[PDB]
Write a protein that binds this ligand. Sequence first.
Ligand code: LL0
Ligand code: LL0
Ligand code: CA
Ligand code: CA
Lengths: 205, 205
Amino acid sequence: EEEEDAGLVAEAEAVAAGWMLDFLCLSLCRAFRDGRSEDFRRTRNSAEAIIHGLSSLTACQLRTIYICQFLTRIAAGKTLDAQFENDERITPLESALMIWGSIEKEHDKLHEEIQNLIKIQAIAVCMENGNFKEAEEVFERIFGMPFKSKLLMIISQKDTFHSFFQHFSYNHMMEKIKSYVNYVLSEKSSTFLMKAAAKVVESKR
Amino acid sequence: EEEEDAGLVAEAEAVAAGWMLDFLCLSLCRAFRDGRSEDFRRTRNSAEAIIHGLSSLTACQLRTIYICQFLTRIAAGKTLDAQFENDERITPLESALMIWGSIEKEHDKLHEEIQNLIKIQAIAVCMENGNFKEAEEVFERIFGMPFKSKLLMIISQKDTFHSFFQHFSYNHMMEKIKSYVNYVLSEKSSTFLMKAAAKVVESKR
Ligand SMILES: NS(=O)(=O)c1ccccc1OC(F)F
Ligand SMILES: NS(=O)(=O)c1ccccc1OC(F)F
Ligand SMILES: [Ca+2]
Ligand SMILES: [Ca+2]
């Protein structure tokens, strides 16, 4: 039974890849929370490679991949040269906003706060780079009244260092996202590979 | 104790990366043995990324990385445009020969047979591409008397489709290497991640 052996082997590889995806998501969340930039970069490279070796995904695995993709776009939020979508006009924070609205998760107060902070910063990052026409195009793509009209007024005046962007800042967006990442870390700390590795480390204490 | 928690977490990540390296080596060996080219390519991408996230290696982990690197160079043996070493003159089969001589393994009859087949084919692949001067430079770097002088005679005559290369062929080299890969597969089939995944698959039968 050479085909039966091959089949059972491929099924075991799929189980192992699932365990590796959860572990890499947990590690990526932790590097983002701790601000360990180089660990985040190396872990993201590993997460992408493992994802390309996975074919069929459960709803839980799709949510895990979206969390990885969301943090990657957020970490690249100021890198306006990075192209995350087939449509080259979409900026990194706009790509993060699309993923945020697709994740099967509760739309609690924190969800809406992170959503609105990414919207403000998607415009703010264009303004800070002197890309005023791009800021207006990002505004049109996002918006699709009171906050909307304040944003359009800021874009038209080219008021880059406007106090509005200091109130709803890039740092405030990152802090709110780190609060959400803390919840993902708590949830995934019990996944198979991390639990088994932690038990090994503890047994040697 | 924020530093103690961080420390135990990094140690658990190192244990998990070790388990992932063994599993990826096993999967890479199997794709090479089965001739599953695309699975080999995707698995190699995952193996490289995991290796860059590992710092301190045990002697066993270094041997595992060398096995991965050796199969990658062998799979690229006919790709003379590929540069595996800082010295751009070194061809892929020459790079595989260097690794073969560095692995902490028994120098049994099969070891020497694979070694000599890689030496012949490192010259053969240059000849087949019409790279006669490169074949002579590869010969000088490798050699570093009876087989040595037959090889130099073949290079000087530009006898690409010589019967000697059909007797000690690229296919014969691949078959001997697959015999060695079967031994590595038997040895690594008992490593943690594959054993646990296989037990999950079996429990669902
Ligand atoms: N390509 S990407 O930068 O959006 C990315 C980042 C982390 C994990 C996966 C991933 O892509 C895809 F592999 F899931
Ligand atoms: N760079 S490479 O093509 O020699 C290679 C292939 C498989 C695994 C690791 C690896 O390099 C290094 F990551 F170990
Ligand atoms: Ca751009
Ligand atoms: Ca070359």
